[PDB]
Subunit: 238 residues, 5 copies
């Protein structure tokens, strides 16, 4: 059950790591490539004790990116060790590291102050399907947002949540608190089988006032398809 | 007829994919290059069932770009599969992927609220010629735009449309709704045999108020000439 | 006389194309380099029917640039074909394409509304010398500029023109209308034997109000020396 | 004891130097790599008279960076000579230099003007552990900050200090005065065993008014693990 | 004495050229590298008639840069010819050219309008030492600055000069007028034996009003050590 503990509980660090495959990877024979896929596969299993790693095919959906990992760990030391080991494998040595972002999952700041009916809706179980699309949008808030007192922010966030409620059924959302660990305040992560819903979700949110306090939004916006690592890697060994 | 259903109907995803050819492609003999063009040509025909692909020569018109595809598909899964297959062909292995943008085609938001005579003019058949120039300008709206109510935006869009009406006859326009799928809100796409008209069209639009709510406009602005894939690729195999 | 028709008449497209030579070019023997200069020389002659090409030594004057062409053509199709052919020559295959900008030459928008004495001074023949320095500054206007009515813009332009009049004799100026063909509204081009004069010219213009409506100015500012192609290329074949 | 004099005394220059390992490093045999690690190790020891160098593993924590040095020296001349020597070693020749920033340590400008109890708290010994995480955030103040008089700035800094006091015990902080030696005003450096606390510390500080006078903040924000040089380099010679 | 005429007189153009050494330079044997240093050394002496060149070790002090020349010439033609010949030497062919900026030295615009005591202090001889640190900060003024009349700017500059007077003794300053020749208005250049003083100088200047009319400041800020060309190049041939 500890797999779920990393995915839901607070205190857990989440890292998003992007990679792009070099040209000269394909100058390697398909034999050696398949051997290299085995190494990576094996390294991940070795770390299955200390961290949970999920993989996404970004190739053909996000610019300048083929692969993303989402890594859950209780210390970033562990995530560092893993990612460094990964980048050291034969396969990793032909990758170019793109972006890298960290944030901790936390007990919610505002939700207690929302009405009880809104709390009930937030508990009712949302999207949960196999091989969803996944989106990742990093966000930095403006100075104005921190200047507001708690009551003001709580009210703006209630408005946010209200706009989003109709999309709970078809879009799963997870929030990571990132300030100080890199150049952004939050990493937002989403899963959905229907991208048009996620698009409508973001359009709904562009109406709420809070959404203009986002000094940075995307850059990049990462789009991909969530899949087992073997499947993604096996595609590269052809 | 399903080819036109992808080009006109709502719900269809449109992807714009840019590529640049490596120096070392030309270090390959003209024989192997012509072989490689056959592979790509064949791959596209294999996907002719599930997607429609159109090609544009950007070399010599847009900076740092040789080729662009506009890809229509009902799911971005299919577009992903295609693009990844493409990038894997021998030809694709010597390409560097530039930008990548997605947006869904939608039933119009404001046009119902326009006067009847304007609706008639929008129906009257515009530009439709062979081997036109094509332009692509990605756009992100400012926060102020979303703060406006529906009535205010409808009025601003009627003004936009009015400015553009005289150009219907010589410029074809298509709009893709992109928010959430990448870093922009819209992808605008245009065809014309006379670039002067398109330039005059944009100047006319720079007068309307709405046009200042474009927090981002171009970067890149892509200019090319639309042509059959064999013609473009054949040029690279010389 | 048609050479002058391309340089002065309206409707003519002007393209500015920058290039930088790769390190590995020099790894080629001086024999092959001279052969390659012949090929380029020959290609230009073959296009002398449909376009006019002029060349500028940017090496040592503009950062990250060795060569610039200014190409006049009546369609960008023809400019595309040429530049693509050029980039295909053995010499072109060792070049890295820098920036690329287009604009059409047009009948003047404001000059009719100026006083008659100012019209006469604008007619009086300015600088025209061999092997001048050449400068190219791209410009994008701010939203405020388009919000102004014609009367306001004509008055601001009369002020611009007034500031510039004393420099007509030692600086030649040409303006290209670029909006919609790339990320800028204008391409400005100048020739002078005395760079201090051009520097004073720009200083004089930084006083006029209109000059603060330039949301983008330069980036890059291109400086070079105008010369026959054979002389530039010959220098690289040593 | 002079090691501590460099780390705490005023007048001492501090340099932060980032590096990333090239792909072709791994194309060298493990033999030669181990040789190369010996050379660097030896160079550092030769400079142990004139400078103190500390090392941080950025690989897997900061994007596009594997290694950082923090170098203390009494002249930047010495730091120059060392870094240039380092970049010349065989290992250094397969590195790509990322960012580089300098600042001098100074006697505090505002702390004398704080209340006595706050001064006592600042003296009380904070975090001091082995192999901490390290963070580095470069900062540039806005024009408004310098326009304030000394009294206004003292008051805003007292507020900053207050917000940060609870974190003294679990976060060590060091400030370098950087204006004029590069494009920023300050380099901030931190050590902590608990990244959660650092994150909370930055959140607490986002409430104070002074924190909005930071025209630039991060870009990059550097995150790593502090460790002996032999251990980091050893990792690369596998 | 004409060496000093280029360094002090008006009308003289000054060019700042930055370079970085390729990895593959060190793949050349130490024999060939020392031969290459001879070539460059000789080329400089051949141009000793027409231009004065001074060299600076940027490696280890400025990011992404190893070498800088400051070149004084009466025409930029001569600077262009030199730099191009330089970049063509075997040594220059393994260099990557970084930034490049030009500006003319001019008779002062405001100093006549200052009080007489301030004029006397400006005459009293400042810093002049061997092998100083050198700093170069490019500056672009904001639109507001040019909107001001001459009296306003003279007053703002007197305030600048007053803030700076105490540093005349330990910092030498030189100003180049750059508008129109590249993307900035001024190139500022400084020599000092004590970097702490220069830092304090810039801090003192950050309090004057004029200093917030700098729309761009640095990017880059170049820091190095001034030395004979032999010594710098010799270091690279080891
Ligand atoms: C799927 C529907 C969504 C729901 C139900 C939802 C709900 C919430 C809730 C309840 C919070 C408050 C967390 C707390 O109390 O600590 C929150 C925060 C946040 N949400 Fe969403 N959200 C949704 C979609 C989105 C989207 C699409 C984005 C942006 C792409 C987004 C961006 C954020 C950000 C940046 C915060 C943190 C703001 C802050 O605490 O200062 N959310 N969301
Ligand atoms: C060729 C003639 C043109 C016509 C007839 C036209 C017409 C329209 C119409 C009717 C809409 C509203 C669609 C809806 O109801 O959702 C629209 C939207 C839009 N148009 Fe155009 N347009 C033209 C050219 C352009 C050009 C040149 C651009 C920009 C390069 C442009 C940019 C946009 C954008 C960004 C929107 C989305 C507005 C929004 O919903 O915020 N149009 N256009
Ligand atoms: C020889 C000195 C110059 C003269 C005589 C001159 C004259 C003019 C005139 C008459 C126009 C308006 C043309 C029309 O009515 O369509 C114009 C437009 C323009 N000029 Fe100049 N100019 C000079 C130098 C410059 C310089 C140095 C720059 C900037 C580097 C510049 C930037 C522009 C721009 C961007 C426009 C287009 C403005 C608009 O139409 O919205 N000019 N110039
Ligand atoms: C417990 C941790 C911290 C403490 C105890 C602390 C305390 C202080 C104190 C006392 C000063 C004044 C130095 C003087 O008077 O000359 C100062 C300056 C400064 N601190 Fe902190 N701070 C802490 C954390 C941070 C953090 C997390 C940041 C930013 C990420 C930061 C940014 C700065 C900056 C930029 C200055 C210079 C302000 C100026 O002189 O304009 N500090 N800090
Ligand atoms: C020894 C210290 C300095 C002294 C004595 C000094 C003095 C002066 C003087 C007298 C002028 C006006 C000359 C004229 O009439 O054109 C001037 C201009 C200027 N100085 Fe300084 N300066 C010093 C340091 C600096 C520094 C550190 C910077 C920036 C890093 C700087 C930036 C400028 C700029 C951009 C101008 C041109 C202002 C304009 O004409 O718009 N100066 N300086």
């Amino acid at each position: 059950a500890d797999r779920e503990k990393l995915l839901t509980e607070s205190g857990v660090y989440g890292t998003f790591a992007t990679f792009q495959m070099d040209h000269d990877w394909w100058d390697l024979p398909g034999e050696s490539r398949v051997i290299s896929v085995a190494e990576v596969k094996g390294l991940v299993e070795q770390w299955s004790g200390k961290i949970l790693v999920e993989s996404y095919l970004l190739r053909g959906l996000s610019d300048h990116a083929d692969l993303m990992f989402r890594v859950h760990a209780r210390t970033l030391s562990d995530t560092q060790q893993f990612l460094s080991a990964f980048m050291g494998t034969r396969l990793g040595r032909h990758l170019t590291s793109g972006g890298l972002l960290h944030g901790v999952s936390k007990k919610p700041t505002y939700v207690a102050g929302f009405p009880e009916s809104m709390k009930t809706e937030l508990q009712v179980n949302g999207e949960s399907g196999s091989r969803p699309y996944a989106i990742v949008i990093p966000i930095k808030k403006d100075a104005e947002w921190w200047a507001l007192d708690q009551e003001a922010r709580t009210a703006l966030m209630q408005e946010h949540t209200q706009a989003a409620l109709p999309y709970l059924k078809t879009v799963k959302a997870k929030l990571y608190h990132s300030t100080g660990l890199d150049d952004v305040d939050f990493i937002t992560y989403f899963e959905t089988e229907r991208l048009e819903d996620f698009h409508n979700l973001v359009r709904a949110l562009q109406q709420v006032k809070e959404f203009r306090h986002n000094r940075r939004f995307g850059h990049p916006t990462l789009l991909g398809t969530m899949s087992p690592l073997d499947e993604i890697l096996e595609k590269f060994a052809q």
